[PDB]
CSV table of C-alpha atoms in Angstrom, one decimal:
chain,number,residue,atom,x,y,z
A,5,UNK,CA,101.7,138.1,121.6
A,6,UNK,CA,99.6,135.0,122.5
A,7,UNK,CA,97.7,132.0,121.0
A,8,UNK,CA,94.0,132.3,122.1
A,9,UNK,CA,91.4,133.8,119.9
A,10,UNK,CA,88.4,132.1,121.4
A,11,UNK,CA,87.6,131.4,125.0
A,12,UNK,CA,84.7,128.7,125.5
A,13,UNK,CA,83.0,128.2,128.8
A,14,UNK,CA,81.3,124.8,128.9
A,15,UNK,CA,77.8,124.5,130.3
A,16,UNK,CA,74.4,122.7,130.7
A,17,UNK,CA,71.7,125.1,129.6
A,18,UNK,CA,69.1,126.9,131.6
A,19,UNK,CA,68.5,128.3,135.1
A,20,UNK,CA,68.2,124.9,136.8
A,21,UNK,CA,71.8,124.1,135.9
A,22,UNK,CA,73.4,127.7,136.2
A,23,UNK,CA,74.7,127.0,139.7
A,24,UNK,CA,75.9,123.4,139.3
A,25,UNK,CA,79.5,122.3,139.2
A,26,UNK,CA,79.4,121.1,135.6
A,27,UNK,CA,78.9,124.9,134.7
A,28,UNK,CA,82.2,126.2,136.1
A,29,UNK,CA,83.7,126.9,132.7
A,30,UNK,CA,80.8,129.3,131.9
A,31,UNK,CA,81.3,131.1,135.3
A,32,UNK,CA,84.7,132.2,133.9
A,33,UNK,CA,83.3,133.4,130.6
A,34,UNK,CA,80.5,135.1,132.5
A,35,UNK,CA,82.7,137.1,134.9
A,36,UNK,CA,85.2,138.0,132.2
A,37,UNK,CA,82.3,139.4,130.1
A,38,UNK,CA,80.7,141.3,133.0
A,39,UNK,CA,84.1,143.0,133.8
A,40,UNK,CA,84.7,143.9,130.1
A,41,UNK,CA,81.1,145.1,129.7
A,42,UNK,CA,80.0,142.6,127.0
A,43,UNK,CA,76.6,141.0,126.8
A,44,UNK,CA,76.5,137.7,125.2
A,45,UNK,CA,74.3,137.4,122.2
A,46,UNK,CA,72.2,134.3,121.4
A,47,UNK,CA,73.4,133.1,118.0
A,48,UNK,CA,71.6,130.1,116.9
A,49,UNK,CA,73.9,129.5,113.9
A,50,UNK,CA,76.6,128.9,116.6
A,51,UNK,CA,74.4,127.0,119.1
A,52,UNK,CA,75.3,129.3,122.0
A,53,UNK,CA,75.8,132.7,123.6
A,54,UNK,CA,78.7,134.5,121.9
A,55,UNK,CA,80.5,137.8,122.2
A,56,UNK,CA,83.7,139.7,121.3
A,57,UNK,CA,86.1,141.3,123.9
A,58,UNK,CA,88.9,143.8,123.5
A,59,UNK,CA,91.5,143.0,126.1
A,60,UNK,CA,94.8,144.9,126.0
A,61,UNK,CA,94.2,145.3,123.2
A,62,UNK,CA,93.6,141.8,121.7
A,63,UNK,CA,90.4,140.5,120.0
A,64,UNK,CA,89.1,137.7,122.2
A,65,UNK,CA,85.9,135.8,121.2
A,66,UNK,CA,83.9,134.2,124.0
A,67,UNK,CA,81.3,131.4,123.8
A,68,UNK,CA,79.0,129.5,126.1
A,69,UNK,CA,77.2,126.7,124.3
A,70,UNK,CA,73.4,126.2,124.7
A,71,UNK,CA,73.6,122.6,123.5
A,72,UNK,CA,73.5,119.6,125.7
A,73,UNK,CA,76.8,119.2,127.2
A,74,UNK,CA,77.7,116.3,125.0
A,75,UNK,CA,77.2,118.3,121.9
A,76,UNK,CA,79.2,121.4,122.9
A,77,UNK,CA,81.4,120.5,119.9
A,78,UNK,CA,78.7,121.8,117.5
A,79,UNK,CA,78.9,125.3,118.9
A,80,UNK,CA,82.7,125.4,119.2
A,81,UNK,CA,83.2,124.0,115.7
A,82,UNK,CA,80.5,126.2,114.1
A,83,UNK,CA,82.0,129.4,115.7
A,84,UNK,CA,85.7,128.3,115.1
A,85,UNK,CA,85.2,127.5,111.4
A,86,UNK,CA,83.2,130.6,110.6
A,87,UNK,CA,85.9,133.0,112.0
A,88,UNK,CA,88.7,130.7,110.7
A,89,UNK,CA,90.0,129.9,114.3
A,90,UNK,CA,92.2,126.8,114.7
A,91,UNK,CA,92.0,124.4,117.6
A,92,UNK,CA,95.3,125.4,119.1
A,93,UNK,CA,93.8,129.0,119.3
A,94,UNK,CA,90.9,127.8,121.5
A,95,UNK,CA,90.8,127.7,125.2
A,96,UNK,CA,88.0,125.7,126.7
A,97,UNK,CA,87.1,126.3,130.4
A,98,UNK,CA,85.7,123.3,132.1
A,99,UNK,CA,85.0,121.7,135.5
A,100,UNK,CA,87.9,119.4,136.4
A,101,UNK,CA,87.3,116.5,138.8
A,102,UNK,CA,91.1,115.6,139.1
A,103,UNK,CA,91.6,118.9,140.9
A,104,UNK,CA,90.1,120.3,144.1
A,105,UNK,CA,87.9,123.3,144.6
A,106,UNK,CA,89.9,126.5,144.9
A,107,UNK,CA,92.5,125.4,142.3
A,108,UNK,CA,92.7,126.1,138.5
A,109,UNK,CA,95.2,125.1,135.8
A,110,UNK,CA,96.0,126.0,132.2
A,111,UNK,CA,97.1,123.2,129.9
A,112,UNK,CA,97.4,122.2,126.3
A,113,UNK,CA,96.1,118.8,125.1
A,114,UNK,CA,95.4,115.7,127.1
A,115,UNK,CA,92.3,113.6,127.6
A,116,UNK,CA,88.6,114.4,128.1
A,117,UNK,CA,88.7,112.6,131.5
A,118,UNK,CA,85.2,111.3,131.0
A,119,UNK,CA,83.9,114.9,130.5
A,120,UNK,CA,81.4,114.7,127.7
A,121,UNK,CA,81.8,118.3,126.7
A,122,UNK,CA,85.5,117.9,126.1
A,123,UNK,CA,84.9,114.6,124.4
A,124,UNK,CA,82.6,116.1,121.8
A,125,UNK,CA,84.9,119.0,121.4
A,126,UNK,CA,87.8,116.7,120.6
A,127,UNK,CA,85.6,115.0,118.0
A,128,UNK,CA,83.9,118.0,116.3
A,129,UNK,CA,87.2,119.8,115.9
A,130,UNK,CA,88.2,116.6,114.0
A,131,UNK,CA,89.7,114.3,116.5
A,132,UNK,CA,92.2,117.1,117.6
A,133,UNK,CA,93.1,117.3,121.3
A,134,UNK,CA,95.4,120.3,121.1
A,135,UNK,CA,93.2,123.1,122.2
A,136,UNK,CA,94.0,124.8,125.5
A,137,UNK,CA,92.0,124.1,128.6
A,138,UNK,CA,91.3,126.1,131.7
A,139,UNK,CA,90.7,123.3,134.3
A,140,UNK,CA,88.6,124.5,137.3
A,141,UNK,CA,88.9,122.3,140.2
A,142,UNK,CA,85.6,120.9,141.5
A,143,UNK,CA,86.8,117.8,143.3
A,144,UNK,CA,85.3,114.4,142.8
A,145,UNK,CA,82.9,112.3,144.9
A,146,UNK,CA,83.6,108.9,146.6
A,147,UNK,CA,82.8,106.5,143.8
A,148,UNK,CA,83.3,106.5,139.9
A,149,UNK,CA,79.5,105.8,139.7
A,150,UNK,CA,78.5,108.9,141.8
A,151,UNK,CA,80.2,111.3,139.3
A,152,UNK,CA,77.4,112.3,137.0
A,153,UNK,CA,75.3,113.4,140.0
A,154,UNK,CA,78.3,115.1,141.7
A,155,UNK,CA,78.8,117.3,138.7
A,156,UNK,CA,75.0,118.1,138.2
A,157,UNK,CA,74.8,119.2,141.8
A,158,UNK,CA,75.4,122.5,143.5
A,159,UNK,CA,78.5,122.7,145.7
A,160,UNK,CA,77.7,123.6,149.3
A,161,UNK,CA,78.3,127.2,150.4
A,162,UNK,CA,81.9,126.8,151.7
A,163,UNK,CA,83.1,124.8,148.6
A,164,UNK,CA,81.4,127.4,146.5
A,165,UNK,CA,83.6,130.2,147.9
A,166,UNK,CA,86.7,128.1,147.0
A,167,UNK,CA,85.2,127.8,143.5
A,168,UNK,CA,84.3,131.5,143.2
A,169,UNK,CA,87.9,132.4,144.2
A,170,UNK,CA,89.3,130.2,141.4
A,171,UNK,CA,87.0,131.7,138.9
A,172,UNK,CA,88.0,135.2,140.0
A,173,UNK,CA,91.7,134.4,139.8
A,174,UNK,CA,91.3,132.6,136.5
A,175,UNK,CA,89.8,135.7,135.0
A,176,UNK,CA,92.6,137.8,136.3
A,177,UNK,CA,95.1,135.5,134.9
A,178,UNK,CA,93.3,135.5,131.6
A,179,UNK,CA,93.7,139.3,131.6
A,180,UNK,CA,97.4,138.6,132.3
A,181,UNK,CA,97.5,136.1,129.5
A,182,UNK,CA,96.4,138.8,127.1
A,183,UNK,CA,99.0,141.3,128.4
A,184,UNK,CA,102.1,139.2,129.2
A,185,UNK,CA,101.5,135.8,127.5
A,186,UNK,CA,100.8,132.3,128.5
A,187,UNK,CA,104.0,131.6,130.4
A,188,UNK,CA,103.4,134.4,132.9
A,189,UNK,CA,99.7,133.9,133.1
A,190,UNK,CA,100.4,130.2,133.9
A,191,UNK,CA,103.0,130.8,136.6
A,192,UNK,CA,100.8,133.0,138.5
A,193,UNK,CA,97.7,130.9,138.2
A,194,UNK,CA,99.5,127.7,139.2
A,195,UNK,CA,100.6,129.2,142.6
A,196,UNK,CA,97.0,129.9,143.5
A,197,UNK,CA,95.1,127.6,146.0
A,198,UNK,CA,92.0,129.0,147.7
């Protein structure tokens, strides 16, 4: 038994942005869908790429928005509302600045942290912060003002392995979450540091 009906991987659309740090959330959803053999369908009604996975043996919906980052809320709200999914049953995977590359953490609630995606999500789900997040560490640059370009950049090769390891392990622990629950999934993921 466990709370998550919809995993969302946040993203800037198109091939120019596919390898940037701000697209980490989507890397999770992408790997998890490759491993469970699901191809994401473009559903314009839901402003994104969606799909449905059977994972031991729970019904998990997945979504990568094709909106601008700052309107990810439209996709998540349109999909949630149509399948009758509540905020507390949504996990949103996103690049986290406050954590380094190689690290990932589950959490419920909290701030957007200046992340435009999470901001609009809070807002379109009706000023409700209490969806889960999967926070993927990406580090942060030197100055508050460099941030936007840090996130719209491609991590160099060696940081990108640390990232790819946290994606890999986040997926595994999402499989754990569906078999053993959040608590066990969380203990395991929060001892991982690449």
